[PDB]
Amino acid sequence: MKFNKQKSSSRRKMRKAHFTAPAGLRRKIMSSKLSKELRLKYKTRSLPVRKDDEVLICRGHNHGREGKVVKINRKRYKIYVERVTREKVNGESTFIGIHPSNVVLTKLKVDKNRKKILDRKA
Amino acid sequence: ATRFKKNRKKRGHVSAGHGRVGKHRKHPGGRGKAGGLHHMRINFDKYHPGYFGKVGMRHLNLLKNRTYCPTINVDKLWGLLPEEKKKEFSENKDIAPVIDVTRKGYFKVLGNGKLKHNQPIVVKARYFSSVAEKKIKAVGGQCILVA
Amino acid sequence: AVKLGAGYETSAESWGTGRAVARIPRVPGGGTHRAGQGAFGNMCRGGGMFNPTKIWRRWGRKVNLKEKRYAVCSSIAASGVTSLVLARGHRISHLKEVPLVVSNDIESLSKTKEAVNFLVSLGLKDEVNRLVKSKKIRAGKGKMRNRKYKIRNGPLIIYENDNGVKKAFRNIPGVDLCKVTKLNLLKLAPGGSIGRLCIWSESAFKKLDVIYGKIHEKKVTKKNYILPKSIVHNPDIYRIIHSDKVQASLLAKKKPC
RNA sequence: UGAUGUUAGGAGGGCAAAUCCGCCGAAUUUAAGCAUAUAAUUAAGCGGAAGAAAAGAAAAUAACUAUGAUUCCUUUAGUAACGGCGAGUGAACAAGGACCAGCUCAAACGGUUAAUCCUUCGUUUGGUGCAAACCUUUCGACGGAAUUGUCGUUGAAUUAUUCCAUGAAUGCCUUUAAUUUGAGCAAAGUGAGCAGGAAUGCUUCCCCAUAGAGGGUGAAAGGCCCAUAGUUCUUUUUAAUUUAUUCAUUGGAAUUUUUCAUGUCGAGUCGUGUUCUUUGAGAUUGGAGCACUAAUACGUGUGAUACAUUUCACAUAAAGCUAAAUAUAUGUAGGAGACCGAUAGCAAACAAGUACCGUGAGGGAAAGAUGAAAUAGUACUCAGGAAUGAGCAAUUAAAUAGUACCUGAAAUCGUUAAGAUGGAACGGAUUAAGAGAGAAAACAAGUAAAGAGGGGAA
RNA sequence: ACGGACCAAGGAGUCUAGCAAAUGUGCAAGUGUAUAUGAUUCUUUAAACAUUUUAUACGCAUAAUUAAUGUAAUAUGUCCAUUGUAGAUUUGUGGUGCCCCACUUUGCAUACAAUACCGGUAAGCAA
RNA sequence: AUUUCACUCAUAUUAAAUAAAAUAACUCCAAGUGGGCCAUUUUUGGUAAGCAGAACUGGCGAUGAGGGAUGCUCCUAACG
RNA sequence: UUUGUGUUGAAGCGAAAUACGUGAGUUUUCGUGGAACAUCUCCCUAGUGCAGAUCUUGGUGGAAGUAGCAACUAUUCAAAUGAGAACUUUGAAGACUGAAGUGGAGAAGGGUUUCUUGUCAACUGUGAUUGAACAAGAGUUAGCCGCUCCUAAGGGAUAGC
RNA sequence: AGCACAGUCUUAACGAUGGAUGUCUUGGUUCCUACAGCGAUGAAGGCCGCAGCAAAAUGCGAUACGCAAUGAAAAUUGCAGUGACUGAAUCAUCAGAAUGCUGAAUGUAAACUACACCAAUUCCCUGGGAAUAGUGGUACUCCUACAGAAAA
Ligand SMILES: [Mg+2]
Ligand SMILES: [Mg+2]
Ligand SMILES: [Mg+2]
Ligand SMILES: [Mg+2]
Ligand SMILES: [Mg+2]
Ligand SMILES: [Mg+2]
Ligand SMILES: [Mg+2]
Ligand SMILES: [Mg+2]
Ligand SMILES: [Mg+2]
Ligand SMILES: [Mg+2]
Ligand SMILES: [Mg+2]
Ligand SMILES: [Mg+2]
Ligand SMILES: [Mg+2]
Ligand SMILES: [Mg+2]
Ligand SMILES: [Mg+2]
Ligand SMILES: [Mg+2]
Ligand SMILES: [Mg+2]
Ligand SMILES: [Mg+2]
Ligand SMILES: [Mg+2]
Ligand SMILES: [Mg+2]
Ligand SMILES: [Mg+2]
Ligand SMILES: [Mg+2]
Ligand SMILES: [Mg+2]
Ligand SMILES: [Mg+2]
Ligand SMILES: [Mg+2]
Ligand SMILES: [Mg+2]
Ligand SMILES: [Mg+2]
Ligand SMILES: [Mg+2]
Ligand SMILES: [Mg+2]
Ligand SMILES: [Mg+2]
Ligand SMILES: [Mg+2]
Ligand SMILES: [Mg+2]
Ligand SMILES: [Mg+2]
Ligand SMILES: [Mg+2]
Ligand SMILES: [Mg+2]
Ligand SMILES: [Mg+2]
Ligand SMILES: [Mg+2]
Ligand SMILES: [Mg+2]
Ligand SMILES: [Mg+2]
Ligand SMILES: [Mg+2]
Ligand SMILES: [Mg+2]
Ligand SMILES: [Mg+2]
Ligand SMILES: [Mg+2]
Ligand SMILES: [Mg+2]
Ligand SMILES: [Mg+2]
Ligand SMILES: [Mg+2]
Ligand SMILES: [Mg+2]
Ligand SMILES: [Mg+2]
Ligand SMILES: [Mg+2]
Ligand SMILES: [Mg+2]
Ligand SMILES: [Mg+2]
Ligand SMILES: [Mg+2]
Ligand SMILES: [Mg+2]
Ligand SMILES: [Mg+2]
Ligand SMILES: [Mg+2]
Ligand SMILES: [Mg+2]
Ligand SMILES: [Mg+2]
Ligand SMILES: [Mg+2]
Ligand SMILES: [Mg+2]
Ligand SMILES: [Mg+2]
Ligand SMILES: [Mg+2]
């Protein structure tokens, strides 16, 4: 790294660490940015995206559309929003996969676990 | 650097500079110093004449620290002094310098060259030669033996 | 270097003359399509290298001390000629003096923004622009060997004692730092070129007469070192030619054929 | 005194080897042939250990104004010396450095009392943990070993000056600085416009930096994400600093004074002769087999040429232990490079010591890439038994990217067109007749009237 | 006379030790900071920087010769620097055009010879 | 013998002619070669040989152009 | 080290040029391609330049629709199935093996080839609806048949040496 | 509706066969740093088994692609299923529990799931009540104790 010699800055090693991460570590990688309004209420800058949160799409062909996250796929590194759909060649309907770093979230769903995190993050 | 090597100039030529009729083969005359005294005799004789045979007595356990002895001639003997100091002695006439050459790494004083006329000097050393000691005496000096 | 015996690890031998094949050694056995192929030799697939590289290649060199010092001295002197500095690629058309000494308040700057403002106010804005625009991704196989970008060389800030220059002038693309008592030729002449742009603090500028024995001081002056001399007293030959003494000894101009 | 015992409590055996210890033991090759020599005190073979092993506290050097256990680095030095004196081979002392350390038996002395040691069974003090467990503790009993020898002293007394260990209670346990594990927090745009399927591009407008290492994200990102600079807690172990006190007993230890006593010091061992190996060691350097076989410190050994008679210096053999500086083609973990880039690099970038071959010991490959996304992998119609083909029908920016899927060369073959063609075909020089392309020299500055733009100055 | 049916990729004077000649560079009767140690060196840095607060580590050179005990380079009349022939450069006059001649002055490098001295050997003496 | 002083021996036509005579003289470091053959004239062995063995010079080899119909060595003549 | 090109299309590849150079080669156009590429300003460095080696690995030819698809006496008529029957099934003929049998039962070796059902991408050197091929399920029953026990030619060990 | 002889060779344009070239890389290679053995308390290696549908590789051991405990903490999936409004679904750590037949292999044997001798063995309640042909021990060499017997 920059100034500590005990960790690597090699393309090979940490490009290997990204694509074989254990499932527990993948949730920290899948994090999104907070809106300005939520950045005053909470001191935090970003959070790991969770299921029932609400988001705004900021990059891609579907930029500008809003909705609610319905599923999270830690193996493909993607999330799915409620009304952003697609047609297969059959005619069957599916969801379009969005990368969580292309998104800003505008409303949380809080519970016991996120409270103890937002408290420390202040 | 391989950039400047001679073999790159022969790179399109057939034989790499060694000849059509006489090849480049491996050891066509022997190995190392092989044929001396048989078919390498002329080279050995005109470039290293006294090579074969032995002469002299044996010395079984040498110990070279017993006979170590560096030398110095009387020419370099006034030059061990600084020039401004050399000036003062040539001016005054009732004083002379006393030089100890062993403190400078010399053991034997040797007698080549010319000392300055009528300029006494006193020299300390372990060994002296006859001519050196005569030259030191002639200009009015003195030799001293130390151990 | 390569692995010690690569390509020679098999029990192969040549079939001999007859059998209407070349006399290269061949892998024994049967039942797999490796059997009977050419085994080792610099012309065979899966064979060995011609002269396998070794670790006892002489990697470094030894350099005489006096020549090193002479070169450092000659590289400081080139840093003080306006024409040479310009020809190395520095954009200094707005500088006032090329030696460029600055007061000791430089030595205790603390934030990068202040250092950038200082550089701009001295007249080096178009030169710090040259550095920012220069970051590009390299061409070739170096990208696979941790050699991604390629940046250009800027000024070299030289100080005597550090109270914040080290950290403030870091993080700016192309900028180097050095302490006066440890001057490095690999920084003063990047890639062998001469005329690096250097910014000297006042204490750094003054220590330079003690380092080279103009004023003597224990543990600072280089011991018994003499500053080198030249074989020419004045390198202006066309001023010598035009002098009256020389001009009166010439001979009338002659004719071509 | 042998033996016996499914009596009680215990140990040895096999695997692994890069570095380490002991034995055994070649030839290829060089000598331009070859036998001594060299290869080599090597490869193959057999045994034994550790995080290092081995070596090691003088029966050592020197010959000086003298040094002072072992190991390793720089030199001594390709030197002294060995050799069909040929090819070839080859040490030691002094000097400069790393590190630094000294001890125990045997033998002498202790008999108004073996003082010594071990098994089993009890019991007794303080600490640490949730628990499991683990430290600390001086008391006893029965039994056995040992005088065919365990333990103490290190020649034994006497004088003075000083030091060490050992018990009682209110006794204090504070701050700081380093050395290592594991966690938390961690600035600054997702702003116009162009073109794009999609900006991380271009052009403009802002900013952060003790953070412009690296990776990810639909195309190149300091300000989109993980991290990065920094900082705060936490776990080890260790230096200072802070606090004692008043009382109790028995043992030890260094010198200093006066005396006596002058001891002991490693045997079929050293050494000599002879035979074979090994060494630079030469009228023999170390080791080994056989024969002979010592002396008692005034002795014994060494001082690089075989003897006899002596002088001088140095040391004290034939018992034992010991950290550091040194090595590491093995195993495991971490970091990195002017290294290779799928015929390259390890044999193996992939279900690689795998598939397959040999009765067996063994031998041993080939094989990477659609797209941003298949949470887009080909729906429907017509022909056909099917395979498959076609479309007005269909995903994609793209299907001449359709899974044998990036790009897609040469050898070799197909289709159409234009030519040539009496037992080879191509080619050099020189022209002509056809066919295909071409305006940058292969013509026209400027003037005048409009129309559409783009700059400079007062 | 031998190799070659065709095409693509691969494919052969290199590395280390030790010596010499040539050339470039630094210093010069000296030259080279060995192994180490030091530092307000520590991503890079395995680089770079430094040298122990009348100054004896070691190599090569400054002196040769002899098996060897060993011995060791004009010589004190003058800090002077052995002798001659040819010879670059310099000094003073004249000739023809700064150049070449003639005379005069100085005498590099080098070539060919002479002489003195040091080590070994022979000869003549020899305490 | 040697050494020192005196006097004197043709030059511009150069102590006989001629001369793309200094393209000279001398050191150092190295390559490749060490199986040859042919023609005129002289010449040894052999009946002789496109046989074997010597001498001087020129060539082929290492070299193409014009001629000898053809031809490694003949005649002319050597190469931007 | 300097100073440059690229989604308004890089490298690569195919055909070319009123182009430059004695030459090795530079440079440019059109097409395909879809992500990187230079530096000639001067220097450093090497696993740095192929027509051959009965060279190594991989791919492809003329020969050529050619040599060939000959042991074991031999086939014919009708019907079923099927997209399609000289070599699948049924009936009728003409024949062979000839008990020293292509008849029955075991050992060595093989390891599911056995059975029933399905079925044809490749194989079954011509065809194929067949098959020992491919797929899904099944199948081996012991006091009396054997091993297991005995000893042989022999093997391995113990005591000692 | 009509007109080109056939073969062979040459040149363009569009295709077939084949897998060079360019770009890519969770792989090699070398150097530097640190640490270091395992086993009768049964090792290294070998064989046999384990999933709802399960061949290889990877992981495990009759509790068998995983149990308990500790730190995170909602999902995990082809179908079927299983999970909260945090000992539960999944990841990591890994100290408790469990760990088939063998192998130095050690009761006797071994192209045998062959054959011995000694002790019957193991649970549940708190002396009763049950189950099971199931469990353990038995190599050789050697040391310290002990035991009796024998010679002298
Ligand atoms: Mg040539
Ligand atoms: Mg040849
Ligand atoms: Mg020859
Ligand atoms: Mg053949
Ligand atoms: Mg290889
Ligand atoms: Mg490239
Ligand atoms: Mg030989
Ligand atoms: Mg030979
Ligand atoms: Mg031989
Ligand atoms: Mg061995
Ligand atoms: Mg063992
Ligand atoms: Mg030891
Ligand atoms: Mg040494
Ligand atoms: Mg030497
Ligand atoms: Mg010998
Ligand atoms: Mg030897
Ligand atoms: Mg020392
Ligand atoms: Mg005793
Ligand atoms: Mg980036
Ligand atoms: Mg960053
Ligand atoms: Mg003794
Ligand atoms: Mg020997
Ligand atoms: Mg001695
Ligand atoms: Mg001892
Ligand atoms: Mg020992
Ligand atoms: Mg690497
Ligand atoms: Mg490979
Ligand atoms: Mg597009
Ligand atoms: Mg691509
Ligand atoms: Mg005909
Ligand atoms: Mg031949
Ligand atoms: Mg042939
Ligand atoms: Mg090639
Ligand atoms: Mg030189
Ligand atoms: Mg004399
Ligand atoms: Mg006398
Ligand atoms: Mg000719
Ligand atoms: Mg004729
Ligand atoms: Mg290129
Ligand atoms: Mg792309
Ligand atoms: Mg090559
Ligand atoms: Mg080729
Ligand atoms: Mg036929
Ligand atoms: Mg058939
Ligand atoms: Mg018959
Ligand atoms: Mg019959
Ligand atoms: Mg019969
Ligand atoms: Mg069947
Ligand atoms: Mg069937
Ligand atoms: Mg067929
Ligand atoms: Mg089957
Ligand atoms: Mg029976
Ligand atoms: Mg028997
Ligand atoms: Mg025709
Ligand atoms: Mg061990
Ligand atoms: Mg098992
Ligand atoms: Mg709990
Ligand atoms: Mg939990
Ligand atoms: Mg058993
Ligand atoms: Mg049996
Ligand atoms: Mg035994």
Q: Calculate the angstrom distance between C1' of D257 and CA of C204.
A: 73
Cα–Cα distance between C108 and C164 in angstroms, integer? 5
In chain A, what residues touch C144 (CB-CB under 8 Å)? 11
Any A CB within 8 A of C226 CB: no
Structural element, H or E, at residue C208: helix C202-211
Q: Calculate the angstrom distance between C1' of D427 and CA of B14.
A: 27
Q: What is the DSSP-derived secondary structure letter of residue C110?
A: -
Confirm if C42 and C51 have CB atoms less than 8 A apart. no
Confirm if A9 and C146 have CB atoms less than 8 A apart. yes
Structure tokens at C170: 């870091």
**First-last CA distance in chain B:** 57
Strand H within 7 A of A72 CB: yes
Structure tokens at B87: 């000036």
Subunit contact A10:C146, Cβ cutoff 8 A: yes
Q: What is the DSSP-derived secondary structure letter of residue C94?
A: T
Angle at C228 between CA B81 and CA C87, to 5 degrees: 175
Q: Calculate the angstrom distance between C1' of D276 and CA of B60.
A: 27
Location of structure tokens 């010395």: B59
Cα–Cα distance between C244 and C257 in angstroms, integer? 30
In chain A, what residues touch C146 (CB-CB under 8 Å)? 9-11
Structure-determination technique: cryo-EM
Cα separations (Å) of C15 from A32, C9, C44, C125? 69, 18, 16, 76
Cα–Cα distance between C190 and C155 in angstroms, integer? 12
Strand F within 7 A of B22 CB: yes
Resolution in A: 2.5
In B59-111, at which residue ranges do the beta strands (DSSP E only) sit?
Answer: 71-73, 98-100, 108-110
